[PDB]
Every structure is written in structure tokens, then in C-alpha cells.
Design a binder for this molecule. Structure first.
Ligand SMILES: OC[C@H]1O[C@H](OC[C@H]2CNC[C@@H](O)[C@@H]2O)[C@@H](O)[C@@H](O)[C@@H]1O
Length: 333
């Protein structure tokens, strides 16, 4: 019931049924940024999968379609005019998931066409021995926030199509990213910049997409090293991207990072599910489950009277949909 209450409250506060988009904040003066809207789309899908209330489930299923329609009305169906390859890939990944839920052809086309544009034209072997460029305008940096989401999108497309092309892509992208965008012990680097090298700044959302791609690769390949990869990145997050009480950091003031716990929590749930299913890493699993539950309880203890939780989970006017999404995500694992 907590997940249902949280999602209903989030919609009541932030969903605009007229534009079929989320508001960026509770002043209701501007709709959410394009890339973040794909992440709120996935939140709707996660609540759809989590709920056991058939009436709410049907409403959320409809909302999956309405989110796409509202975005396409403002931004079009062809996102390849957007210079941000990551923006495109977040929508390609969301579209693959929407296809799995709904069966509507438009979503498979959207996923496959946009994945192909990025992977087939924005992969480069010369700089840094591999990796996808951040932008399709200028080619100066290759980033975790495009590469790991691309591996995830490829894994969804493999699951849908069974075409080994997509598994091969996920494997190649992840191998490059593990080698060039991590320290080999679970710390995920932000990016590798031409003429400079690695920028080893770690953030919640890049830990998340690394973990999710690793768990997906473990499941698709049967290679246990990928599960180990995921566990090491989860451990790094729990020990090194938290405050002194173990509560996940607040990553403001940057607007893109403020809500990153949303993406982290989505992917930590994948890891929790796989550990529960396989019985692997039982010691870590117990520690991890306790730490997750603690974070969730602390976050929700700061909910306001409308059942909205700001993204500064360690503490207590205007609430923002991206920063507030993480607490909702956490109850819809
Ligand atoms: O420092 C945060 C963030 O900044 C830049 O990306 C911003 C967004 C652009 N497109 C949508 C999201 O994927 C990004 O967060 C990049 O420098 C990025 O690597 C970095 O984490």
C-alpha cells in the first residue's frame, strides 16, 4: 500500500493531465525536462509492475501511453535532432520497456530506431579505445550517463527480439565502460574527456545504470563475474556515497543530479531481486537489505502532509518532481 499511496500522491501533485506531462515543480509553471521525463515515465511503469490494485494498475497502464503522447506532442517522434545522445538513449530505453508492457508497435520502432542511431553512428574505437560519445554535435567526451544506459537499452532489446546483435552490443559497451569508466572495484567515473583523461567523479545515477547493466548481463550470459561487478558497485555506493549515518547523499544543487537517487533505487531493486532469487552473496544481501530499508524509512519519515518526500532524505515550500521521485521509486521496487 505504501507504493500505491506514494505514486498516487506524486501524480496528484505533479501530473498535468492537460499537457500529458509532469510539472517540474509544485508551482506548476513549467513541465519537466525531456530526459528526466523518460525517468518519470519509467517510474509510472515501475508502479504499474509493483501494484496489486487492479484499478490503479489500469490507470497507470493508460498513463504509460499518455506520457509518450504528451512528449511527442511537444518534442516529436524523431528525437535524433537532439544533440544529447544520452537524452535519446533514456527515451529509447523507456520505449523498449513500454513495448514490453503494452505491445504497441510504435514503442519497439522508437526503441530500435533510436538505439541504432546512437550505437551505429556514435560509437568510436579511436579515442579511449571505444565508447559512445556524449553528444552527436561535438565529439569531446564519452560518458557513463550514455554508455551504461545504452548497455541497458541493448539488454531490453535483446530480451524482446532474441537478436544476438543486441547482446553483443551490450557486452561490448559494458566491457569498455568497466575498463575505462571504473576503477575495477565498483567506483564508476563520470566521463573520459579528450585531451584530459578520466574525470573520476562518482554519482548515484551512474552507479545505478552500471549496476543495472551488470545484473542484466549476468542474467543474459550466465557469467558470474557480472554479478560480482554489480555487488562491488553497490558496496561502493553504500559505503562512499552516503552521509555519516549511511543515508544516501543529496547531490544538489545540480538539477540533473538532484533526482539521481531515482535511477539508483530502480537499479538496486534489480540487484536485490537477483540476490534473493539466486541466494548468492548471502552476507552482503542481508547487510544491503537492512541498509536499503533504513534509507527508505528515513526518507519517508520526512514526508509532508500530501505524502511527498523531498530529495534531501536527511532533512525536512516548493517541491520538485525529480528530487521527489526517488522516495516513490523506493516503494515501487
Ligand atoms: O554533472 C552532472 C552531469 O552533467 C552532464 O550531463 C547532464 C545531463 C545531460 N543529459 C541528460 C543526463 O543524462 C545528464 O545528467 C554530464 O557532464 C554528465 O556526465 C554529468 O553526470
Amino acid at each position: 500500500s505504501d507504493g500505491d499511496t506514494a505514486m498516487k500522491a506524486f501524480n496528484d501533485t505533479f501530473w498535468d493531465p492537460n499537457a500529458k506531462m509532469f510539472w517540474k515543480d509544485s508551482k506548476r509553471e513549467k513541465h519537466q525536462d525531456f530526459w528526466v521525463e523518460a525517468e518519470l515515465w519509467e517510474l509510472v511503469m515501475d508502479a504499474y509492475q509493483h501494484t496489486s490494485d487492479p484499478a490503479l494498475k489500469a490507470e497507470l497502464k493508460t498513463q504509460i501511453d499518455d506520457v509518450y503522447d504528451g512528449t511527442v506532442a511537444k518534442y516529436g517522434q524523431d528525437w535524433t535532432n537532439n544533440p544529447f545522445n544520452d537524452d535519446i538513449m533514456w527515451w529509447a530505453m523507456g520505449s523498449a520497456r513500454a513495448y514490453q508492457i503494452t505491445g504497441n508497435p510504435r514503442y519497439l520502432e522508437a526503441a530500435r530506431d533510436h538505439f541504432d542511431f546512437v550505437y551505429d553512428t556514435q560509437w568510436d574505437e579511436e579515442f579511449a579505445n571505444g565508447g559512445i560519445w556524449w553528444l552527436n554535435s561535438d565529439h569531446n567526451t564519452k560518458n557513463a550517463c550514455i554508455n551504461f544506459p545504452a548497455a541497458q537499452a541493448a539488454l531490453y532489446l535483446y530480451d524482446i527480439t532474441k537478436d544476438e546483435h543486441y547482446l553483443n552490443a551490450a557486452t561490448k559497451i559494458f566491457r569498455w565502460g568497466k575498463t575505462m569508466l571504473t576503477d575495477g572495484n565498483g567506483k564508476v567515473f563520470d566521463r573520459i574527456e579528450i585531451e584530459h583523461g578520466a574525470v573520476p567523479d562518482a554519482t548515484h545515477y551512474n552507479q545505478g545504470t552500471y549496476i543495472g547493466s551488470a545484473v542484466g548481463l549476468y542474467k543474459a550470459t550466465g557469467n558470474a563475474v557480472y554479478l560480482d561487478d554489480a555487488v562491488k558497485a553497490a558496496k561502493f555506493t553504500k559505503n562512499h556515497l552516503v552521509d555519516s549515518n549511511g543515508v544516501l547523499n543529496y547531490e544538489g544543487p545540480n538539477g540533473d543530479l538532484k533526482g539521481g537517487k531515482t535511477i539508483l533505487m530502480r537499479n538496486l531493486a534489480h540487484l536485490q531481486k537477483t540476490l534473493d532469487e539466486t541466494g548468492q552473496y548471502p552476507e552482503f544481501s542481508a547487510e544491503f537489505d537492512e541498509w536499503l530499508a533504513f534509507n527508505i524509512e528515513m526518507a519517508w519519515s520526512h514526508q509532508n502532509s500530501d505524502h511527498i518526500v523531498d530529495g534531501n532524505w536527511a532533512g525536512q515550500g516548493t517541491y520538485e518532481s525529480w528530487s521527489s521521485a526517488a522516495a516513490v521509486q523506493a516503494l515501487n521496487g
